[PDB]
Amino acid sequence: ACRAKCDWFSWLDDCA
Amino acid sequence: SGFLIPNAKYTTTNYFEFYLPYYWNIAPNMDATITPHYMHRRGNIMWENEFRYLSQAGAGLMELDYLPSDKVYEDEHPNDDSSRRWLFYWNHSGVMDQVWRFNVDYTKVSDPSYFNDFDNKYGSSTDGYATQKFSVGYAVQNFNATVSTKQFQVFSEQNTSSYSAEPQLDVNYYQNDVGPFDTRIYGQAVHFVNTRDDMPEATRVHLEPTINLPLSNNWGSINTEAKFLATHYQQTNLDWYNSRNTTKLDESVNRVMPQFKVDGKMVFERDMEMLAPGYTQTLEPRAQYLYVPYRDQSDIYNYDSSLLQSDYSGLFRDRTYGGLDRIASANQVTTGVTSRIYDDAAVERFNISVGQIYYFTESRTGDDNITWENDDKTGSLVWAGDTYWRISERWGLRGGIQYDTRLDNVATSNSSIEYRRDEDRLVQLNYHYASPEYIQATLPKYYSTAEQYKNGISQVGAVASRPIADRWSIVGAYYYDTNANKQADSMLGVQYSSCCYAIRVGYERKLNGWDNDKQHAVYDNAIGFNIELRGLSSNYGLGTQEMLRSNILPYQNTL
Amino acid sequence: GWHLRDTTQVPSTMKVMILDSGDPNGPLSRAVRNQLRLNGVELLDKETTRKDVPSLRLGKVSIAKDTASVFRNGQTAEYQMIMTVNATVLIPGRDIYPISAKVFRSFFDNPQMALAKDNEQDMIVKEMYDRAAEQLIRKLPSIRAADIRS
Ligand SMILES: CCCCCCCCCCCCO[C@@H]1O[C@H](CO)[C@@H](O[C@H]2O[C@H](CO)[C@@H](O)[C@H](O)[C@H]2O)[C@H](O)[C@H]1O
Ligand SMILES: CCCCCCCCCCCCO[C@@H]1O[C@H](CO)[C@@H](O[C@H]2O[C@H](CO)[C@@H](O)[C@H](O)[C@H]2O)[C@H](O)[C@H]1O
Ligand SMILES: CCCCCCCCCCCCO[C@@H]1O[C@H](CO)[C@@H](O[C@H]2O[C@H](CO)[C@@H](O)[C@H](O)[C@H]2O)[C@H](O)[C@H]1O
Ligand SMILES: *Cc1nc(C*)nc(C*)n1
């Protein structure tokens, strides 16, 4: 799942 | 010891039932009771055994009921291997050394139709399932670790599939001296197993460190809190589910998400001299902002996450679902106000609270399947209110209402007014309402499609109890369903109390089941006679209180 | 004629007190201690040599879970949970004053997600204790009003 690029500590919607 | 005095009753399900209890004082802090219960319709003796014990681990009660053969059950199930019925119950609770905590709540029955046919002491015909929980915990002032197992036996023959945690370990740690902040950490390790062999099985590991800064004054308070939620899912036996559903479950799933919540309260006071000299009124506004980012949880099966009721107290809750499988995103502000009225002695006599939730963005869990009555997503969607008024030392009134914009109707409501001169002299009226839209939204589809479920709830209940001549007690109860215009529960009871004995005669007509063939409810009428020997204790009550608890809708004191 | 609350929630005499219970590590004792620390109250051990300090003993805690409403087939629909807590606040010179708290909650039943409902029930219990704690704090001033009169 998730996306190709994601941040674990994001605070944004799609782990941006 | 010796034989107890027998009791009897007549029911529409077992005809004439005779009890012949026998006490057995085995030792101090533990005793037993053996009861042959002869039922004439089934033509056999149910052997009931009760074992009460006290120990260093705590206090416990066990019950084992066995009917070797049954006639009605044999007729209803001709191809069954045997007609024997049985019940096992174990309720234990204890704390040893102030740190060890042992809890056991175990119930098991041979068949789902057990409680509709026999007496309801540790179970009831209103129960939909039997719970089997064990829990051992170690708790100290800043720490607690609990390992528990939960299993459920579902009685309804619609879908017997259920999930159980085997085992679940919860750990909580606190520390309140980290500078100005207060910190805590929560951890959990759970194993989800389904009764069916084709349903998915899971292993979940969850960590949640939270840090909050509180600040307080004589007139206001504000608490900020930042938390992180890390969850790891290992899912197996998911071939069958993936074979039929477009949404595919994943074996290994990682869900990491932050949460920011800021709460604030204010208190205002005034001397309400217009209404009463010396009476005080407090107006307390309260606000909260909650932000949790979206996370696509569509590839995680829902094991123990369910929608939560939103009363006034629940408006400020930080979670939309129980458990940890579903964690809805949130960008919302909850606003409420509570008015309290205290008398001259600083005793609270009145309170009324009203609150609402404003959603800036839609709350998405990734897997949204709830069927609302409209497509409202942002704005003031949830409203709640409650009130409690102590009119005098004998009169009391409580009320609550929950309105949801998405349902386009009042979601739920309840009310009650009670007069109570003493334990024996009391009257009470209560009303419960749950709209059909709420039933359709927060319950399975066959609930919406079923005739016994789709009407919602609209129930009016009256309870009365009065003594006569200081030796007679009369108790009555009547719960009536306004939607179907049919009675749901009815109870009468008369007890004569003397110096050395008490004689009780009770009667109850209650809803007991559903007739799928003719499509009407089933009613069970019972009338029991029970005499007990007094004089061995200081209890001189008239028996009104435990008479009021006999029916399937027991009396509760609303003050 | 409104104005901000110019007096603290807990009375000035009960700023430093002793929290005594038979289950000091239980959830109710933890909730009461957290609520007292929220209001800037200093809690001492039960063996504290300081005299003339009010002592709050937490009594028995009762939790009942009954059926409030039923469906057309007799199955339960709403479960009503009742929490009853008792405590005694002793001013060592004056007297012992008893106080109590009652918390009402309700939740719908669903056998098909029964385990989840159980978790919800646990959450409800974790709420209720906190509410009960606030109720106990809200009877702290009245006990003071019961002491000046005598
Ligand atoms: C303790 C009480 C005080 C708490 C602090 C105040 C909380 C309120 C501010 C929250 C900030 C988010 O901003 C608040 O919500 C959304 C964004 O989420 C903004 O809304 C804007 O962006 C959203 C994107 O989500 C668009 O869909 C919307 O059309 C646009 O108006 C609102 O105009 C603003 O009111
Ligand atoms: C202090 C804040 C307010 C809460 C205090 C307590 C007051 C509420 C308790 C009494 C409940 C009265 O209940 C309220 O009225 C009736 C049932 O009576 C329902 O009202 C119903 O009216 C008609 C006829 O049945 C339907 O077409 C309608 O859709 C439905 O709403 C409400 O949905 C319910 O909310
Ligand atoms: C606050 C006041 C509380 C006290 C009032 C409630 C107690 C009074 C009894 C009410 C219930 C009695 O139920 C009412 O009468 C009889 C039983 O008597 C029911 O009828 C029943 O009769 C006999 C039992 O005698 C059954 O074999 C039969 O199958 C059934 O139809 C009616 O369908 C119902 O209308
Ligand atoms: C599943 C996942 N993966 C990454 C890299 N980040 C997030 C937030 N979630």
Side-chain angles (χ1 to χ4, degrees):
Chain A
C2 300
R3 326 201 299 81
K5 293 179 179 179
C6 67
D7 190 347
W8 296 103
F9 327 109
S10 178
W11 287 95
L12 300 186
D13 289 345
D14 258 341
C15 263
Chain B
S1 293
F3 278 104
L4 271 299
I5 193 133
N7 90 78
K9 52 144 77 152
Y10 188 92
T11 64
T12 37
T13 59
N14 310 321
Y15 292 160
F16 160 68
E17 321 184 6
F18 177 80
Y19 295 69
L20 181 38
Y22 176 86
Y23 200 57
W24 172 217
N25 173 36
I26 162 159
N29 69 46
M30 62 171 147
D31 64 69
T33 314
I34 307 177
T35 311
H37 173 208
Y38 170 73
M39 298 151 324
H40 180 77
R41 181 177 181 170
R42 313 183 193 284
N44 217 318
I45 301 173
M46 170 150 300
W47 300 96
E48 318 182 357
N49 314 268
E50 160 209 275
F51 181 63
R52 304 179 303 168
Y53 66 97
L54 256 162
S55 39
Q56 311 144 13
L61 172 141
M62 307 195 7
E63 176 94 20
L64 191 268
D65 303 343
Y66 194 66
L67 172 53
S69 70
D70 200 343
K71 216 53 49 188
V72 186
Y73 190 79
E74 169 178 328
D75 292 338
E76 282 163 6
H77 303 86
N79 289 337
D80 184 1
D81 290 345
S82 191
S83 72
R84 67 182 150 256
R85 324 274 291 273
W86 51 264
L87 169 64
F88 180 76
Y89 174 79
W90 189 13
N91 183 267
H92 174 96
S93 72
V95 182
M96 183 176 282
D97 299 317
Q98 308 192 330
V99 295
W100 297 103
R101 325 175 68 88
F102 312 101
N103 289 274
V104 173
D105 168 35
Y106 193 89
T107 312
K108 198 157 194 180
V109 295
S110 55
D111 63 87
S113 317
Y114 185 86
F115 286 120
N116 299 318
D117 308 341
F118 306 104
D119 45 327
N120 303 349
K121 304 181 39 56
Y122 321 111
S124 174
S125 68
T126 60
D127 293 339
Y129 52 91
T131 299
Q132 314 152 355
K133 288 166 63 171
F134 299 92
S135 76
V136 179
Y138 176 77
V140 297
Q141 215 84 66
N142 63 336
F143 184 82
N144 63 77
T146 307
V147 54
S148 65
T149 301
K150 321 209 208 51
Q151 307 168 89
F152 304 91
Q153 173 188 18
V154 181
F155 296 151
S156 68
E157 284 250 63
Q158 289 283 320
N159 235 332
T160 54
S161 80
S162 64
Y163 267 100
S164 309
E166 287 176 359
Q168 169 177 318
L169 162 72
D170 289 345
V171 182
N172 282 285
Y173 181 70
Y174 315 90
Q175 197 163 242
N176 297 340
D177 55 65
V178 193
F181 316 92
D182 311 336
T183 68
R184 65 182 181 88
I185 187 156
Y186 172 62
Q188 187 185 75
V190 66
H191 184 46
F192 296 120
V193 201
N194 195 289
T195 63
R196 295 176 64 186
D197 56 350
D198 60 346
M199 276 302 231
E201 296 187 25
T203 299
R204 174 178 74 206
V205 169
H206 173 81
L207 277 180
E208 183 178 2
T210 189
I211 175 167
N212 64 275
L213 172 55
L215 299 175
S216 173
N217 263 337
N218 309 316
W219 45 261
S221 177
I222 179 177
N223 182 65
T224 309
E225 171 197 272
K227 183 169 71 172
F228 236 104
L229 295 174
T231 59
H232 183 49
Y233 295 91
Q234 275 284 126
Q235 314 192 93
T236 60
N237 199 21
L238 71 184
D239 289 345
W240 173 78
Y241 182 90
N242 293 17
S243 81
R244 323 168 306 89
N245 303 294
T246 301
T247 319
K248 298 292 180 65
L249 298 176
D250 298 7
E251 206 224 322
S252 148
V253 175
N254 289 337
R255 181 177 65 83
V256 179
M257 76 188 342
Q259 152 172 314
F260 178 74
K261 181 175 68 165
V262 48
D263 201 318
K265 323 178 194 191
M266 284 208 108
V267 184
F268 300 85
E269 282 198 332
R270 84 184 281 261
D271 289 345
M272 47 175 330
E273 278 304 327
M274 65 198 201
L275 165 144
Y279 273 49
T280 311
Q281 191 188 357
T282 83
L283 183 69
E284 316 156 39
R286 185 183 181 183
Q288 172 196 98
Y289 178 64
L290 179 61
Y291 177 73
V292 177
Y294 177 55
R295 294 291 185 263
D296 196 343
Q297 299 146 73
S298 53
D299 58 346
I300 292 161
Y301 194 92
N302 186 7
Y303 306 95
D304 64 340
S305 281
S306 66
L307 202 80
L308 301 167
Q309 267 202 9
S310 39
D311 51 346
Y312 177 75
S313 34
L315 291 179
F316 298 90
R317 202 185 287 114
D318 49 342
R319 294 290 177 80
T320 302
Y321 304 85
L324 311 168
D325 294 321
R326 292 283 170 275
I327 294 195
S329 86
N331 194 351
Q332 73 197 49
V333 54
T334 310
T335 56
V337 55
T338 305
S339 186
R340 298 185 199 281
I341 291 176
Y342 304 94
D343 52 7
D344 323 280
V347 194
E348 166 176 1
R349 308 291 287 280
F350 174 79
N351 65 359
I352 179 164
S353 312
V354 54
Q356 64 101 351
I357 304 182
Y358 193 93
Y359 296 93
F360 294 104
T361 61
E362 174 184 15
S363 297
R364 287 163 294 151
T365 67
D367 167 40
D368 293 303
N369 58 330
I370 294 263
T371 59
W372 300 114
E373 287 288 314
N374 56 62
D375 289 345
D376 298 3
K377 319 224 203 69
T378 69
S380 309
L381 298 185
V382 170
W383 288 74
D386 65 9
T387 185
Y388 162 72
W389 190 10
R390 187 64 168 266
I391 304 158
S392 84
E393 61 260 344
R394 305 173 175 156
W395 286 94
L397 152 69
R398 289 170 176 266
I401 191 161
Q402 310 164 20
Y403 172 79
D404 204 319
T405 284
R406 290 159 300 190
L407 304 175
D408 250 346
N409 203 1
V410 162
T412 299
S413 77
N414 73 275
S415 174
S416 77
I417 175 176
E418 183 178 2
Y419 161 82
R420 181 175 170 133
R421 190 201 286 258
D422 184 1
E423 252 211 337
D424 310 317
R425 167 74 169 133
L426 77 96
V427 183
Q428 174 182 100
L429 303 178
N430 51 64
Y431 176 71
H432 296 270
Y433 174 81
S435 65
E437 295 95 4
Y438 178 77
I439 296 297
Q440 141 182 273
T442 68
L443 287 172
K445 319 332 312 200
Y446 86 100
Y447 273 61
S448 187
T449 75
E451 246 300 337
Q452 70 262 36
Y453 294 121
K454 74 175 174 55
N455 284 309
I457 294 287
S458 177
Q459 175 191 283
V460 188
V463 179
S465 64
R466 143 156 295 284
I468 306 181
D470 288 345
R471 295 152 93 92
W472 295 77
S473 64
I474 296 90
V475 159
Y478 193 84
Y479 287 84
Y480 171 84
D481 188 292
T482 67
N483 282 328
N485 277 359
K486 283 285 216 310
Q487 169 214 107
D489 181 47
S490 163
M491 175 250 305
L492 256 164
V494 182
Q495 170 166 314
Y496 166 80
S497 302
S498 76
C499 262
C500 52
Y501 64 95
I503 308 176
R504 176 182 305 173
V505 201
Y507 160 80
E508 179 184 23
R509 169 166 218 259
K510 57 160 198 175
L511 278 165
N512 202 21
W514 189 259
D515 185 280
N516 284 321
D517 304 343
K518 314 311 274 323
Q519 286 302 295
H520 49 48
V522 173
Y523 295 93
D524 181 65
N525 303 273
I527 165 163
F529 180 83
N530 158 73
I531 163 164
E532 293 177 350
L533 281 185
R534 293 284 200 78
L536 277 308
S537 68
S538 291
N539 170 35
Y540 282 101
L542 301 185
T544 59
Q545 287 308 306
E546 63 297 18
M547 256 181 316
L548 280 168
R549 305 288 293 175
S550 69
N551 50 311
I552 59 164
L553 290 154
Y555 162 81
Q556 279 295 0
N557 192 351
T558 70
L559 300 147
Chain C
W2 296 94
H3 56 89
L4 288 160
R5 190 176 67 186
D6 184 1
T7 193
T8 59
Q9 220 301 326
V10 166
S12 64
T13 65
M14 329 207 171
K15 225 46 172 153
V16 163
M17 67 174 282
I18 311 171
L19 180 53
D20 175 36
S21 64
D23 184 9
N25 312 321
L28 173 84
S29 176
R30 166 183 315 288
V32 162
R33 173 180 320 272
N34 157 55
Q35 281 293 337
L36 292 174
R37 181 180 159 275
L38 252 58
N39 311 353
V41 169
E42 176 191 346
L43 306 181
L44 316 188
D45 200 325
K46 65 177 197 172
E47 293 177 350
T48 278
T49 165
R50 315 176 81 267
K51 281 342 190 153
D52 60 56
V53 171
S55 172
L56 174 59
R57 263 145 299 110
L58 301 169
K60 183 169 71 172
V61 181
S62 295
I63 316 193
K65 207 244 299 202
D66 42 308
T67 289
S69 50
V70 300
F71 278 115
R72 280 319 301 160
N73 61 348
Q75 302 292 300
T76 189
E78 268 259 341
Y79 274 100
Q80 171 107 55
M81 313 208 44
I82 308 265
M83 159 155 313
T84 314
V85 178
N86 297 288
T88 72
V89 177
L90 172 160
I91 301 137
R94 325 299 313 278
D95 218 313
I96 286 202
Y97 304 89
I99 62 180
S100 40
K102 196 125 62 68
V103 189
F104 284 66
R105 304 287 330 254
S106 34
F107 71 105
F108 257 80
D109 189 21
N110 190 2
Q112 290 213 351
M113 288 230 83
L115 160 65
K117 298 316 286 205
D118 184 1
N119 283 40
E120 162 174 354
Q121 167 170 337
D122 288 357
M123 154 161 315
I124 295 181
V125 170
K126 177 126 298 193
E127 295 302 320
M128 275 198 237
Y129 283 127
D130 289 345
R131 303 278 90 70
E134 293 177 350
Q135 289 195 20
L136 297 188
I137 267 63
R138 276 203 306 272
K139 315 171 151 253
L140 282 204
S142 81
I143 285 166
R144 183 88 183 129
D147 196 37
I148 310 327
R149 172 159 49 257
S150 78

